[PDB]
Amino acid sequence: DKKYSIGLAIGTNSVGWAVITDEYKVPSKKFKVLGNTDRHSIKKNLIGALLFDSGETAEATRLKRTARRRYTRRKNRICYLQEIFSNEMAKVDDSFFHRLEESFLVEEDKKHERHPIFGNIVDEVAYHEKYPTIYHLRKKLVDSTDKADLRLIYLALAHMIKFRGHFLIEGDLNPDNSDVDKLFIQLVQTYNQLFEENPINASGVDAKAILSARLSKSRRLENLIAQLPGEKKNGLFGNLIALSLGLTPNFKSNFDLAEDAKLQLSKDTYDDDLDNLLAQIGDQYADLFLAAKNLSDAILLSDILRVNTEITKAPLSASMIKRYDEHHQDLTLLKALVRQQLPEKYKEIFFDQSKNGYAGYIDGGASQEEFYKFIKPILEKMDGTEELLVKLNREDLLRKQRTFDNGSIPHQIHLGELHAILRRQEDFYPFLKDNREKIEKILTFRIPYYVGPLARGNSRFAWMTRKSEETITPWNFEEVVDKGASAQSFIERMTNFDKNLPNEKVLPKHSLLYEYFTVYNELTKVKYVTEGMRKPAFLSGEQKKAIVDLLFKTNRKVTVKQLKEDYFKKIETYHDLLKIIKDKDFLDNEENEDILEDIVLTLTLFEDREMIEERLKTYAHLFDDKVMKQLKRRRYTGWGRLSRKLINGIRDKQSGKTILDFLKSDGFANRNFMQLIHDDSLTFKEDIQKAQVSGQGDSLHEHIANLAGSPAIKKGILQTVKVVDELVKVMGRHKPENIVIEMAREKNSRERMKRIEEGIKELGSQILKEHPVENTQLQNEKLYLYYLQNGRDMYVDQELDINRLSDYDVDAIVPQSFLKDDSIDNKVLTRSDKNRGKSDNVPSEEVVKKMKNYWRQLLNAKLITQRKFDNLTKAERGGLSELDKAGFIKRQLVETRQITKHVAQILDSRMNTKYDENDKLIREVKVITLKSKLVSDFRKDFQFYKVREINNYHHAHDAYLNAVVGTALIKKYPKLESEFVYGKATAKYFFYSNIMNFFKTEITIRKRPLIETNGETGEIVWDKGRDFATVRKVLSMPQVNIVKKTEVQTGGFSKESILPKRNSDKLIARKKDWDPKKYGGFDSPTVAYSVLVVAKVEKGKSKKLKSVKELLGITIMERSSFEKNPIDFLEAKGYKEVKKDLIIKLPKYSLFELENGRKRMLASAGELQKGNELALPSKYVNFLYLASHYEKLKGSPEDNEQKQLFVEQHKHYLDEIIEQISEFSKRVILADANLDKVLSAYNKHRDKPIREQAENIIHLFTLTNLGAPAAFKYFDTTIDRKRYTSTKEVLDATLIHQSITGLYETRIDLSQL
Amino acid sequence: TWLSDFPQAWAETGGMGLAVRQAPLIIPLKATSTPVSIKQYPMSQEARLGIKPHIQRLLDQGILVPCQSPWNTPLLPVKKPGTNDYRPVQDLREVNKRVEDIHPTVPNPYNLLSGLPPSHQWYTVLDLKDAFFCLRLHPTSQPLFAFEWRDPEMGISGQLTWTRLPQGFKNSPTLFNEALHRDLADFRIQHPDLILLQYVDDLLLAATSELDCQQGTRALLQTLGNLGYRASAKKAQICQKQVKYLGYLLKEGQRWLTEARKETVMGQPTPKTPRQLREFLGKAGFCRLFIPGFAEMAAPLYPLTKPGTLFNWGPDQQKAYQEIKQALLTAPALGLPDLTKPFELFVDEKQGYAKGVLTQKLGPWRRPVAYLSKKLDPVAAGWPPCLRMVAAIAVLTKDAGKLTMGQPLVILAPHAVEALVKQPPARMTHYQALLLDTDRVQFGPVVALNPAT
DNA sequence: CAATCCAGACTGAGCACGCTGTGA
RNA sequence: GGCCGUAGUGCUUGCUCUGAGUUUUAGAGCUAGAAAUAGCAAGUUAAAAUAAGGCUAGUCCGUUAUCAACUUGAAAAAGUGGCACCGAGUCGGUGCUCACAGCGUGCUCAGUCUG
DNA sequence: GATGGCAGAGTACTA
DNA sequence: TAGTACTCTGCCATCAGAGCAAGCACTACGGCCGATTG
C-alpha cells in the first residue's frame, strides 16, 4: 500500500502513462512472465506509452455504399428497359440481349456470335460505318421519319437511360431556347409593352457576352445593371434579370407587395410561387415571367449545347457529332502538318502509347490536359497551326464525346431526345406507343432522399415504411411507399431528445408552446419602475396576462416604450397564423392546441408542398381552400431544445401545476425556468433526476462512440481508459490519489485552389490570370496569404509582388503572446510588421480606418472570414481591453475543451463510485486536467528539452511531467481546484503570469525559498535541491514500456486498380468465371493476419512430404473462408497434416525477440518492422536541441549567449552521437550499407557548422527508429529504406504477447514448435 | 557425570523431545478466512544448502511429513548471529494476519531478573534445545503450515507440513510458554526453597547453598526428562557461581555486564553516517542501566539521529562520544533487587535532563540497583527550576515502577519539592496522584546527593 | 448596502520509522 | 458564472444522384516480303463489371467502430500475475519470518483553554 | 502520404 | 548445368462533383441576470 498518482498524455495515435509516488519517483516492480520459456520474471518501470494506428471516419465507407447502391439501381433500370422490349426483341432477334450480356467474354467463352448487335460481321461493319458514334445513331433516330431497326432503337434508349445526366434543375427545359440576344430583346419588348410610362432601352448592349460571361452570376448581374439605363439593382427589370440568370430576387419592392414572395426559377416550387404572385398583383405580368423563364433556359443551355437547334430536335447529339467532325478534321490537318514539317516525330506522336500524344491520348491513359501539354510546343514550333493553337487555348481541340466536362448536361436533354425518338418510332411499334409514359418514368425516376433505401427489415440504414407489401417498381412508388411517414421518420430519426427528459422528443423551435414559454420567461425578467414605487417590483400573473394579450398577441416585437404607453399609460408563430387563418378566437382558443401543434409539426417536418397538403387534408374541413393553400405555402425551419412533456406535461406533486402554469402565475417571485428546475422544494428537480436515472449508462465503448469529436481522439480516449484500469489492477487494486491528464490540440490544396478561384471570381480581379499558381505551390503559407490578399498589402495601401515573396512580414492580428493561433484566419501578410502600430495590441485605429473598405471588400469576396474581420476591426470597437488581456492569459493555462471535460467526467465516474449518507459522492480520486503549455514551459525553463525524432520515450516523459506538474500545482494552490480539478483585471493578470514561478529559484530579483511550502498548512510541495534531480533521473531511465497495439487489418480487399491480362499468379479474378490470365484482375491483397502453420508439403516429382514451418497471409477476402474451416483452407493451399493446436494467429505488429535484444515487428506475412527504441543520453538530447535551435531562439540575450558557448564547448558530442547511432544499428538495425553511407556522409560533411551538422544528425535517427523503415537525408546524401522482406528468421524467435501497458507478457519460444 | 545420571533429559543422548502432557493443539482461524497459496520465494544457492541438512534430519524425526494442502508459505533461512547454522524459518507472514490473536503471557526481560533475590547465590542455567518442536500439532491444523521443497536426490517433491509448532509463527512463543509453565508448575510446589526463572525456553534455578542447587538440579533434570523436554548439555552452566543469563553476568548476586558487550560498544570507530551513529546508539542504550546520567550524556547525539539532517561531527558531538566510551569502561555492578526490603531512589535534574539512581540497603551502605535517566518533555522543559524537579521525579518514578514490581519506594532529592506538589505556585493533577499515593511512594528526609550517584 | 463565491499551547489514544537487546 | 438573441466557421452521421477512369470483347487493317520486318491506313464509339460475394431474396447487405495471451463460457462477459531497498544501456542484484523489551523522533484523530 | 505489394534483374544452392 | 529459391531496387497506389437532413464545437457581439452574509 502506497499513495500514488497517474499521469496521462493523450494523442491521436499515442497514449503515454506514468505512475509516480509522493516524492515524484516512478516505482519499479518485478512482473511474472507466462509461457514455455525459461524466463519467469522481469523487472520493469511503471512508465511507458501505447502506440496505435489512427482511427478513421465512415466517410469512405458511406461513399462506397452509395456507389454500390447506384450501380445496383442502374442495372435495375437496364433490366426494366429490357423487360419492356423483351417480347418484340424475341420476335426480331431472340439472342440480342444474351449477346449483350456476354460482351465481356473471350471468343472461346461466348456461346453466341462475337458481334453483339447483328451477329454477323458484314452487318456489324456496315452499322459501325454508318454510325461511327452512338450520337450519330441518336440524332438519326430523332430526326428521321422512316422505320428504324428495333435493336438500334433499344441501343439509343438504353444509352440515354444508362447515362441520364444531373438532376440539379427542376421543372422542365426547352432546348429550342438557344439564342440569348433574341430572347433578351423579346423580354425588353415585353417590358416596354407593359411598362409604357417608363420604358427600358437596351440597344447597343452586348447581352450575349454580358449574360454568358464566365464571371460570377452576381458580377454578371452587376455588369448588366451598369450597362443598362433606366433601372438598377432591386428594380423590377433588375430582379427579372437576376431571376433569369439564376439569383433569387425579392419582388416585394417592385409592386409594393409588403410580402417577400421570393421566386427561384430552378426550384420546383416556382410554379406555385408564380401563381401566388400573380394572384397578388395581376395577370398582365405572366408574359414577362414567361419571357424571363425562356431567357433563363437559353442562358443555361447555350453554355453547353453550343449548336444550332433550329434544324434538329437533338441539339446534344448534334453537338457531339460536330465535335466528332472537328476532331476528324483537326486530326487530318495535324497529320498532314507533322508529315510536312516534322516527319521524325510522327512515330512518337501517332504510334507510341507510352509517351503522350495522339497514341497515348486514345490508346494510352493520357488525359486531355496531358495531351494538350505534350502537343502545345510541337504546334508552336510549326507554321499553319494558328487555328489549332487557338482551339488548344480555348480547350476545344481533338475532343472525345465522353469527357469529364459532360457533368453539366441536364437529364432533361436526354429526356427530350428519348421522347422525340419514341414519338418518331411509335407509329411503327404499337408497344413503343403504349409504354411511352413508363419509359419516360424509367429515365426520370429517382428515389427521394427522405425515403431512403427500399429495404424490407434487413438494413440498419433504412427507415422507409411500405403501405403495401409488394415489389417497388418506379411505376408504383407512390402507391407502395408511404412517403409522408417515410419523411417524418427520416427527420425524427436524427433530431435530438430532451436532456431533462431523455426519452422525450423535442418540440419544433417555432412551436406555439415554445413561443409562449420563451415570451413568458422574457416577460418575467423585466422589472418595471414607475412613480410611487418604494422598491422595484415584479409583474404579477394577471399583469403578465394583460401585457401578453395587449402587446405580444397584437404586434410582433414588443418594446419598452410600447409597454409603457399601451399598458402602463393607457390602462395603468401566433402572428404568422393570424394573417393566414384570419381567425382570432380560434388561435386564442385552448381546446385546439393539439391541432395547432400538429400543424406546426407538419410545417417543420415536411419541405414539399405536396406532402404538406396531403398531411393537412385532415384539417381541411376546419379551414377554407385559400386558408389551406396559405398553410401549405408557409413552412418553418428549426427544432427546439425543450420537450412538450417538460414544458406542460409534468406537474408539481404539491400544487398540481406545470412549469408553464408556474411561469404564468409567477407573481411577485418571478422565478424563471432555471429557478423552477433548481428549486429544492419543487418536485420538478426530483422528476428530472428520476427521468435521467432511467436507462442509466451504456457500455464504455458505446458511450465513447456516442461522444462528439474525432474518431482518432475517441480511440485514444478508449485506450486511455483501458490503460488506467490496467494500471489500477497492477498497483494492487488501489485507486490513485490524482489522475493528471492532458490532450493534444490535434485534398487541402484543392480546397485552397477552389476557394481562391471563387474569391477571385467574386472580386472581379485577374490575379490568377496574371500568373497561374498550382495547388502544390499554393500550399505555401506566404503564397496563400499573398493570393488571398489580392496581391496587395493588408496593413497599408500598397501593392505586393509575387516575385518579391519570402521577404514580406507575416503578422498575427491578435498578438501571439495573448493567443497562440497560427491559422490563416489569424495570420496576415504585410510588407512590414511595424505598420500595424503597437506590437502588444490589435492593429492601430489609423490603419483600421485606412483599410476598412478593403477588408469589407475581402469579406464580401469570401477571401476573409467574419472572425478575421472582427479581429481586424477591433480597434474601432475599443481594442484589446485589460479584461480581454487577462482572460486571454488565463485561458492559456486552464483547459476548457468539451472533449477534455468528457474524458474527465468518464474517468471520474469510473474512479469515484461510493456515496455518503446524504448521497454526496466521495471524491476519492481527483481528476486534474492541464494544457500542454504548462509542461512545455516547465521543460523549456528547467532544461528538460524534448526532441521527438530520437525515440518514442517522449510520450512517457510528457505523461510523467504532467503528473508531477499537476500534483505540485494542486498541492501548492488548493484554491485552484475549481479551474483544474474536475468536480480585478490587474490582479488576475499577474496571478496567472506567475502561477508557475514557485518552481524556479529566482524570479524576474526575488530570492524565492529553496523549499516550497504549502502555506497555511505544513505540506512541502517542492524541494528544488532534490526534486529536480529526481526528474532528471526519471528522464534518463533506459527502460520505458513502449507497446505498439497489434491489430487485425480490415477494409478493402486489395488495390482497386484493374490490371490488364498477364500470366501471373498474383492476379485476382474480378468474377468467379473470369480467368485473370485472360481478363485481368486485382492485385496486392491486404493481409488480415498471418497464421503460423507447421505442416508437410509435396516437394519434387515423388511428392515427398517435407516438414515445413512458415507464415501464411490470410487476406481480407478469404478471412471468413479460413475461419469457417482452417483445416480445409490449409489443405486446399497445399499443406498436408497440419496441426490445429500449432496454428497460431499473428496479427500486425506482432513482436519477436531474436538475439542481443533485437526485436522485429510483423508488418505482414512477408515483411518485418523494427521494434527497438534507442535510449539516447539526456545530455546528448539537450545538446542536439540547443545546437539545432528548436523553434529558433526564444531566450533572453544574456541566456542566449551562454547556450551558444555551451554548444561551442560541447562540439565533440557529435562524434559520440554518431558512435551511439552506429553501435545501435550494428546491434539491432543490421543495415550495413545504410550505416556505411551514413558514416561516409558524416565524414564528408564534418567541416560544416555545428547548427547544420546537428540539424542533419536529427534526421539520422530515422535509421534507428521503431516502425516501418523510411528514407531520410543527411545534407545532399539521401538514404533509401532497408526493408526486412523475409519472415523466416522469426520462426525460431520468441513471440511476446504484451498487454496494453507491456507489464504483463507471455513469451512463447517458437523454436520448440 | 551429569549426562550419565539422566539419559532422558539431555538432548545429546535423549534424542528428540515430545511433550507427553500437553495435548495436540488446534490452531484456530478467523471466521472470514480463506486458504492462501504463495509460491516459494527465490533463495540463494548458499542459503539453500544451509537448510538442506535440517530438512533431511527433520524428515527422519517425523516433524516434517509430506502432504497436499491449499496453504503454502515460502520457506526462508535465518542464519544465527554466530557462524552459519542457517536455522529454518517458515516465513508465515500471510498466515499470521489470518490466524486468530491470543493475549501474550511471555515474560519481559526487565522483570525476570527482578525476581532473583541476592540470598540465592548458587545458580544453574539450563537451555532447552529445539524448544518449539516439543509441542505436538493436531493433524487438522497441520495443512495450515506448508512449504514447497523439491530435491531430486530425495525423490519427493511437494508440500511438507509440520507436525509440531513451527518457527516464525506468531503464536509459537506464547503457546510454548504456557505449555512449559503448566508442566513445571508442579515442580515449583515440591521445592519451595528453589527459585525457578523461565524465559521461553531458558530456565534458571537459584538455590541457597551448594547442596541445595545439586539436589534441585537433579530433580529438575528428572522432571524435564519425564515431560519430554531435552536440554542442551554443551551449554549448560550447572552449580557455578559465575553464570550468564539473559545477556547478564551473575556473580556475588550482582548483575554485572559481560566484558564482550563492552568491547563491542567501544570497538566501533567514530561514526560518520546517521546509520553508523544509529548502530552505536543501540548498543549504548542496552547498557543505559549501568551508565549514570546516560540521557544527558548522549543528549547531543540524539538530534543527529534524524533521517533529515546533516551529519556534522562537531567538537561537542565528539565530547558526547568520549563520555560514553569512558563511562562504559568503569561501569559499576548493579545489584539484584530484593523485593522483600524497601527501595530507595535518588532524583536530580539539571538543564531539562532528569538523572538518578535506584539503590537498596546493603549492610551499612547503599548498593545501586539501576541507573535511571530520561529527557524531560518540552512542556516541562520551559518550567522554572523549582517546578522542573517535580516533573523529573514523576518521570523517573514511572521508570522505577517497571523494575521495583510496584513495591513502595522512597524518593530522595536535594530540594524539598515534595511539599511543593501539595501547594504548587490537567497534567499537574495527574502528577499529584502519582506522587501522593502513600501505598506506592513516599518522601523521606530531604537531603542532597553526590553528583556521581 | 457592499463584497465575495482560523492561530497558540497542552493532553490522551492509536500508528509508524530507525536502531539495539533476549530468545526462537 | 449562467440565461439568451444574432451571425459566421469547422467538423460528424445518414440519404438521393452525376461525370469520368480502369478491364475484356465488338468496330474485317492494306501492300511487299517464306519469315521476322518495313512502308501506309486508322484512331473519337458501344456492351458488361466496378470490391470476390451473401441469404434474409430486398430496386437489401458487403471497406466505420471493436480486437495481447490463458481459464470458464453458447455468447454477452467474468477471472489470471508478492513487497521493499540499492543501483542502471532497454532492466539487474540483494533481502523478506517471529514474540517480548529499551531508546529517539514524527504523524493522524479527538478533547481542553485563550485570542 | 507513408508503406506494403509486385515485377524484374542479380546471385546462389542443389538434383 | 538447369531448376527453384532468396535478395535488392524502383514504381505504384480510382478520382472529381451536386443537393438534402439532423447534430456538435468554437468564435464573436450585445442585454440582462446572482445570492448570501457581515
Residue numbers in the entry:
A (entry chain A): 2 to 573, 593 to 766, 775 to 1011, 1031 to 1051, 1057 to 1365
B (entry chain E): 24 to 448, 455 to 482
The authors write:
With these modifications, we reconstituted the termination state of the SpCas9–RTΔRH–pegRNA–target DNA complex using ddATP, and successfully obtained a three-dimensional (3D) reconstruction with an overall resolution of 3.0 Å. The 3′ extension region (U97–G115) is resolved in our density map, and forms an RNA–DNA heteroduplex with the NTS on a weakly positively charged surface facing the RuvC domain of SpCas9. Nucleotides C103–G115 in the 13-nt PBS base-pair with nucleotides dC(−16*)–dG(−4*) in the NTS to form a PBS–NTS heteroduplex. The clear density revealed that nucleotides C98–G102 in the 6-nt RTT base-pair with the newly synthesized (reverse-transcribed) nucleotides dC1†–dG5† in the NTS, and that U97, located at the 5′ end of the RTT, is kinked from the scaffold region and forms a base pair with ddA6† in the NTS. The RTΔRH binds to the PBS–NTS and RTT–synthesized DNA heteroduplexes through the positively charged central groove. Notably, the M-MLV RT catalytic motif (YVDD) is located close to the last U97-ddA6† base pair, indicating that this structure captures the state in which the prime editor has just completed reverse transcription up to the end of the RTT sequence. In our structure, although the RTΔRH proceeds with reverse transcription up to the end of the RTT, there is an approximate 10-Å separation between SpCas9 and RTΔRH, leaving sufficient space for further reverse transcription. In particular, the ribose moiety of C96 stacks and hydrogen bonds with L99 and R116, respectively, whereas the G82-C96 base pair forms a stacking interaction with Y64. These structural observations suggest that, if not halted by ddATP, the RTΔRH would continue reverse transcription beyond the RTT into the scaffold region. Our structure shows that U94 of the pegRNA is positioned close to SpCas9, suggesting that M-MLV RT may not proceed further.
